[PDB]
Motif scaffolding. Structure first.
Motif, PDB file in Angstrom:
ATOM      1  N   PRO B 294       0.815  -1.211   0.000  1.00 47.93           N
ATOM      2  CA  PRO B 294       0.000   0.000   0.000  1.00 47.93           C
ATOM      3  C   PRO B 294       0.847   1.260   0.000  1.00 47.93           C
ATOM      4  CG  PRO B 294       0.108  -0.928   2.198  1.00 47.93           C
ATOM      5  CD  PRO B 294       0.876  -1.861   1.318  1.00 47.93           C
ATOM      6  N   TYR B 295       2.169   1.127   0.028  1.00 41.83           N
ATOM      7  CA  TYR B 295       3.091   2.244   0.034  1.00 41.83           C
ATOM      8  C   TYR B 295       3.779   2.460  -1.300  1.00 41.83           C
ATOM      9  CZ  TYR B 295       2.416   1.238   4.969  1.00 41.83           C
ATOM     10  OH  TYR B 295       1.861   0.971   6.200  1.00 41.83           O
ATOM     11  N   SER B 296       3.450   1.656  -2.301  1.00 41.85           N
ATOM     12  CA  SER B 296       4.092   1.749  -3.602  1.00 41.85           C
ATOM     13  C   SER B 296       3.672   3.024  -4.307  1.00 41.85           C
ATOM     14  CB  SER B 296       3.734   0.539  -4.469  1.00 41.85           C
ATOM     15  OG  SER B 296       2.334   0.435  -4.683  1.00 41.85           O
ATOM     16  N   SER B 297       4.485   3.451  -5.278  1.00 42.82           N
ATOM     17  CA  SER B 297       4.158   4.682  -5.988  1.00 42.82           C
ATOM     18  C   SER B 297       2.787   4.588  -6.639  1.00 42.82           C
ATOM     19  CB  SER B 297       5.227   5.020  -7.024  1.00 42.82           C
ATOM     20  OG  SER B 297       5.495   3.906  -7.861  1.00 42.82           O
ATOM     21  N   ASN B 298       2.372   3.399  -7.078  1.00 45.36           N
ATOM     22  CA  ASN B 298       1.029   3.258  -7.641  1.00 45.36           C
ATOM     23  C   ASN B 298      -0.053   3.322  -6.568  1.00 45.36           C
ATOM     24  OD1 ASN B 298       1.899   1.993 -10.604  1.00 45.36           O
ATOM     25  ND2 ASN B 298       3.230   1.369  -8.897  1.00 45.36           N
ATOM     26  N   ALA B 299       0.166   2.691  -5.413  1.00 43.42           N
ATOM     27  CA  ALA B 299      -0.869   2.678  -4.381  1.00 43.42           C
ATOM     28  C   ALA B 299      -1.185   4.087  -3.895  1.00 43.42           C
ATOM     29  CB  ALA B 299      -0.448   1.779  -3.215  1.00 43.42           C
ATOM     30  N   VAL B 300      -0.216   4.975  -3.955  1.00 48.51           N
ATOM     31  CA  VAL B 300      -0.364   6.340  -3.501  1.00 48.51           C
ATOM     32  C   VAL B 300      -0.097   7.241  -4.711  1.00 48.51           C
ATOM     33  CG1 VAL B 300       2.016   6.608  -2.642  1.00 48.51           C
ATOM     34  CG2 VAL B 300       0.109   7.733  -1.469  1.00 48.51           C
TER      35      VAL B 300
END
Lengths: 418, 418
Positions: B294-300
């Motif tokens: 949930p911390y990936s560049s896509n998730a955020v």
């Protein structure tokens, strides 16, 4: 501290980020000399023979080299010129002869050393004291060589090695390692800086030779790096004070930001013998009580960035090639640096101090402005924004100078391109 | 989903679209150390010779390499500086010597590995620990090379591989694979990063080396990529807070869009050790205790876009070369990023903080503005539209940069070019 958003009801999520900062300060409260664990003492002559062949042989033994260096500490000794006051320890007093063995405590284990030698040594006789000093100095130079590394250091890493060999091939040292053996052994032993006992010993040697003038003081060329180890932030500040021609106090007055507070406190812990001319402090990162240095460029990042941003404004090449602390708000530091740099570039505070006669001095004594307040108001008038002239000057300095990858110059070039 | 279309008589049709993700978080309630299942214990030296020959021959068996790396963990030991606890209490305590095996749980089965000596390379005697360390580091470095796959990264892969090779060919490591073997094994071992056990072990090694200093700490150069893996969003946010000189909470105030809400909740979920210096979180993706991050560049995605768009406006090269998340409304992100960068580029919040006297401090207390509200109003006045100056700055940054394939620099150039 918690900041709140609403989806259908109010959520009040807290913000958590990692910013751990633990720094250990150097001080001797237990009154204990720095201690390291070492191997069995070898026969001085036999130890010299083993290490010489091993070095010629490009064979690196950590335990043998350090044990040899500890035995050699007995060779170099001198009487102390004045009483020596350190961190509660006074191992040296005026008229007392001292050695490296007396300055630190070395723990010797009876565990036998390997003292193994690949070969390449033809000397059939017991070594003289100078031969001992020549070998001792070469190892310390291996340590300095390990610290070099870098990129685009060709014809520079070789150059420093050449300087080292030249010192120990001329009197008072005798040539024992032919030529380029020290450079090629360093290729075999480039990461020897990591070894703690090797680093500790180099620091001990540098401290003794700096305090006491010696015939073999030139060995310090290898151990010079140990002084102010990992203290570039404190060193940069002292240099900034001298280049700017201010007193430490007046200098700090110009630091118009909250972030400096933590750093100013960090670098000026109470006591700590910063002012003391000869002290354990100069070599605290070597030796013991190192921890992580609270004086490193990272620990004092905002002050460091401001100092070198000011330096770049003044064309100091040292600042141009320093690597910027990216975490510590470089953009804001560059703006403050612009205002501080404009104030200090091309301007000096001059007063008549020399007079022909005492009466003339009295007449001068009876009789635009450089001040922190003046600079602050100037910054406030422009709304805390760089002047266009600041930008031009920054751009002119960065463009003419060759920019290293992570240097301040590169940051100035990338940030302001027009 | 309300909609009305007019034919001869009026008709109503609803729209349908699909989007949903899980985003499981890393914290473990069972307090069970991460577990990996491997084969029968390796034959010590025999496993070393088989994998080394395989290296020179560029043929390696993944299961065997994993068992060898698990066995080699016992070789690497160091004393723990501080008491260590992550999630459920870690066993490591201050002053306790530990191995990497102590950090994760390794599970072994009856089936034995092939340990074949594919390469004709021969070793007369049983290997020394440095040799083992040199092989462990070279094997781990394949993981890093496996990760760095993409367009136009050839010369760069070779440069990192050369740096890897020189580290492991010089002390404290010994040259066991000569040169260019690492690149050729990477050619056959390019997707080794996908292998779960290989990633698990690399993360374990990196966790152990980060906490405990070691002679062979240079092995981390392969495993550095494992730290904060797939958490670029969170990493970008923390840097953004520091570069911009905001308290993180204040920074979120500037995120003026509904889309940021879901992401802000996603990355700031409590109970995850985002607040602990050496916790399992830093290597959570590499270790078993993970899901899609949930911390990936896509998730955020929106927060990530906004951060680097502001970074591009300030000339941050890292942002210039980061790859934009195209799904998360980059255009709106760029507009907001334009205003925020305008606020943060070339401006600082400066206040007098250091005084000679307490009285002086009190007088300064008796005595255009940076605030979220001011920025929001400025955006509102221009109708949520980029200023001409925003566009000029964006174009000036992007054009004078070697725009990478899907980078933010490329997005800026393609979008605003006249």
């Amino acid at each position: 501290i918690v900041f709140k958003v609403n989806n259908q009801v109010v959520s009040l999520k807290p913000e958590i980020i990692v910013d751990q900062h633990e720094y250990k300060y150097p001080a001797i409260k237990d009154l204990k000399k720095p201690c390291i664990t070492l191997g069995k003492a070898p026969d001085l002559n036999k130890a010299y023979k083993s290490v010489l062949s091993g070095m010629s042989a490009a064979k690196l033994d950590p335990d043998d080299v350090c044990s040899y260096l500890a035995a050699a500490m007995q060779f170099f000794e001198g009487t102390c010129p004045e009483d020596w006051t350190s961190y509660g320890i006074v191992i040296a007093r005026k008229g007392d002869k001292i050695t490296p063995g007396s300055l630190v405590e070395i723990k010797r284990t009876d565990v036998e050393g390997n003292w193994a030698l690949t070969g390449g040594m033809e000397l059939t006789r017991d070594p003289t004291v100078p031969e001992h000093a020549s070998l001792v100095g070469l190892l310390l130079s291996l340590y300095r060589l390990s610290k070099i590394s870098g990129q685009n250091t060709g014809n520079y890493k070789t150059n420093i090695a050449d300087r080292i060999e030249q010192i120990f091939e001329t009197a008072p040292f005798v040539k024992i390692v032919e030529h380029h053996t020290l450079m090629t052994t360093h290729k075999m032993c480039a990461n020897w800086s990591t070894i703690p006992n090797f680093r500790f010993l180099a620091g001990t040697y540098d401290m003794f030779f700096s305090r006491i003038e010696h015939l073999y003081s030139a060995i310090r060329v290898g151990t010079v790096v140990t002084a102010y180890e990992d203290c570039s932030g404190l060193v940069s500040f002292t240099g900034f004070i001298k280049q700017i021609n201010l007193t430490a106090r007046e200098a700090i007055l110009y630091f118009f930001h909250k972030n400096f507070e933590e750093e100013i406190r960090r670098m000026f812990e109470p006591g700590q013998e910063t002012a003391v001319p000869h002290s354990y402090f100069i070599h605290f990162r070597s030796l013991g009580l190192s921890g992580k240095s609270p004086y490193s460029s990272n620990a004092v990042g905002h002050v460091f960035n401001l100092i070198h941003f000011v330096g770049c404004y003044m064309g100091q090449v040292r600042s141009l090639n320093a690597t910027v602390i990216a975490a510590c708000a470089p953009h804001e530091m560059s703006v403050l640096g612009g205002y501080l740099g404009e104030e200090f570039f091309g301007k000096g505070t001059f007063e008549r101090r020399f007079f022909r006669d005492e009466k003339e001095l009295q007449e001068y004594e009876a009789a635009e402005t450089r001040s922190p307040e003046a600079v602050y108001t100037r910054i406030m008038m422009n709304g805390g924004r760089l002047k266009r002239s600041h930008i031009r000057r920054y751009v002119s300095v960065s463009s003419n100078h060759q920019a290293r990858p992570n240097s301040f110059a590169e940051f100035l070039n990338k940030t302001y391109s027009s």
